Symmetry: C2
Subunit: 281 residues, 2 copies
C-alpha cells in the first residue's frame, strides 16, 4: 500500500499506474507522500516507510547509492531497455536481410524489381556478451529459428546453444553477430582487423553496445575490403559529431535503441511499476 | 525404419537427411527400396510397405494424387513459405516502428538526431486471415510480447488472444494490422474507406496477401486524410505496371516476401525430412492453407 512517484508525470503515466498498481495508493510529485515505494528518475527522498526505490532508467550508478540505508532496496529498470534494444537490433538486422531500403526506393521510383532476401530461419547468430540485451535477443533469435552462439563468462540460459571460447571462434560460426558487450579495457577495440578477418561470407554485424568496442579505422577499411560484410549500428564514435558515416554497406541509427535523453518510453514506466508490484507480490 | 528418397540427392542433402533422420534406415535413388516413407519431388513409386509420401514442394497439384491408395498419406512441404513471409512482415513492421529509413538517411549525411521509436512489446497485432502465414506471424508476435487478435474463418490456435467478430472489430482492437487473407469474391476490395475509418491513431497496416483485397483508391485516399496511418506492403496493384507508388506514409517491397518465382530455399529440403520424422512419432504438421 502506497507508492510515491517522485517526478512530474502526465496522465498517461498515471494511467499505467492505475492499471498496474491497482490496490496501491498513488501519490504524485509534488505532493510528497511517505510511502513504502518511491519511483524515481535521479533523485530520491527518504522517509520512515521507505522499503524500495524504483529507478526508471537502465542503470542506477547515476543516483546517490551511498545515501541508501541498507534497509532499503534500490532497483534498476534494465528489463525495459533489454526489450527495446532487442527490438531495435532486429529491426536493423531485418532491414538488411530483406533489403528493405533498396527495394523501397526502387518501388517508389515505380520500379518493380525482384531480388532474393536473406532468411533468418536456420542461421547462426553469434553474440558478444550476454547481459539483459543478449538474453532478450537470444529469446527473439530462437523464436525466429536461429541458432545462438555466445561469447561470455556470464551464466547463460537455455536460449544459448553454444558457448564460444574466443571471439574468433564465435565469428567463424556466425552468419550474424550482435555486439552487446560491456566496454572494458579488454573489450575496447576488441573488434579489430584481426578479429574481423574471421568473418563468414555475408556476415552482418549489429552494434548496440558502445562504439569503442569496435576499432573505427579498422571497421572502415574492413568494410571497404569486404564489400559483402555489413555493419549495422545504433552507436557511432564521438556522438554527436559523427564523421565517416557515408558508407554503402552500413545502416545506422542515432543511439535510439533505448532510453532517450529527451524522454521516458511507456514501456519503461510500465515495467518499473510492474517491478514495484512484483517486489511486494 | 525405412525411407526412400526417390530422386538424385547430393552429399549436402544426404547429411541433412542423416542428421534429421538418424535412427531410420535410408535408401537413395536409384537403389529403390520398398520403404514406409518415400520423399519425392514429382513421382512416387508404390510398394507393399508404403505408408507415407512426402513431397518436398509446397503444392502437390503436379502429383498424381488420384493414384494414391487410400491407406497412403500424402504430405506436402509449405512451411518455408510462411516462415519467409512472416519474417518479411516483421521486417517492414520494424522498419517503420524504428524509423529505420529516415534515421539512416540522416546519420549518413552526418546529422545526428534523436527521435522516439515505436515499440511492439505490449501492443495489439490484428491479423486478418488466420492461415499458415497468420499462424507463423502470431508465433513471432507472441515472442515479441505482442497481444494477438485474429479475424478468421474458424480455427485459431493458442497464439491468439482475441477472436474478433468482424474486420471492423479487428481494426478497432489493433495497433497493427496484418493482412494475410486469400483473395476471393468476398475479400476483393474488402479493405475500404468504410473499414479504414476504424483505424486507431497511428495504425500500421501490413499487406502480405494480395493488392486486390484492398481498394486502391480508398487506401490512397485514406493515407492523405489520415496521415498518421502507414501502409506497408509487399504487393501492389497490377504489378509490374505499378503506379501511384510514391506515397510518403508507406514502405513497399516487390512481392518478395515468400522469396521469388520458383525459388527453392535451402531450408525447404530440411523441413521436408523433418516432417517425415515427425510423422512417424505421430506428429506431422497440419497442412494449413497460406
Ligand atoms: K528504437
Ligand atoms: K522476404
Amino acid at each position: 500500500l502506497d507508492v510515491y512517484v517522485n517526478f512530474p508525470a502526465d496522465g498517461h503515466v498515471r494511467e499505467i499506474a492505475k492499471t498496474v498498481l491497482d490496490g496501491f495508493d498513488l501519490h504524485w510529485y509534488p505532493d510528497y507522500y511517505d510511502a513504502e515505494a518511491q519511483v524515481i528518475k535521479d533523485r530520491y527522498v527518504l522517509g520512515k516507510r521507505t522499503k524500495m526505490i524504483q529507478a526508471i532508467s537502465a542503470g542506477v550508478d547515476h543516483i546517490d547509492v551511498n545515501g541508501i540505508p541498507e534497509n532499503v532496496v534500490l532497483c534498476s529498470n534494465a528489463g525495459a531497455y533489454s526489450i527495446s534494444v532487442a527490438e531495435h537490433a532486429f529491426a536493423l538486422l531485418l532491414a538488411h536481410a530483406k533489403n528493405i531500403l533498396e527495394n523501397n526506393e526502387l518501388m517508389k521510383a515505380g520500379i518493380f524489381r525482384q531480388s532474393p532476401t536473406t532468411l533468418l530461419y536456420g542461421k547462426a547468430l553469434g553474440i558478444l556478451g550476454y547481459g539483459g540485451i543478449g538474453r532478450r535477443v537470444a529469446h527473439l533469435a530462437k523464436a525466429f529459428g536461429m541458432r545462438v552462439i555466445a561469447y561470455t563468462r556470464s551464466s547463460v540460459d537455455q536460449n544459448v546453444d553454444v558457448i564460444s571460447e574466443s571471439p574468433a571462434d564465435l565469428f567463424r560460426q556466425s552468419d550474424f553477430v550482435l555486439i552487446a558487450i560491456p566496454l572494458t579495457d579488454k573489450t575496447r577495440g576488441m573488434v579489430n582487423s584481426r578479429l574481423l578477418a574471421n568473418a563468414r561470407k555475408n556476415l552482418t554485424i549489429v552494434n548496440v553496445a558502445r562504439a569503442d568496442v569496435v576499432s573505427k579505422p579498422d571497421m572502415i577499411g574492413f568494410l571497404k575490403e569486404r564489400s559483402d560484410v555489413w555493419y549495422l549500428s545504433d552507436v557511432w564514435w564521438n556522438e554527436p559529431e559523427i564523421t565517416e558515416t557515408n558508407l554503402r554497406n552500413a545502416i545506422l541509427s542515432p543511439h535510439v535503441a533505448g532510453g532517450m535523453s529527451g524522454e521516458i518510453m511507456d514501456i519503461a514506466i510500465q515495467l518499473a511499476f510492474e517491478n514495484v508490484r512484483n517486489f511486494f507480490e
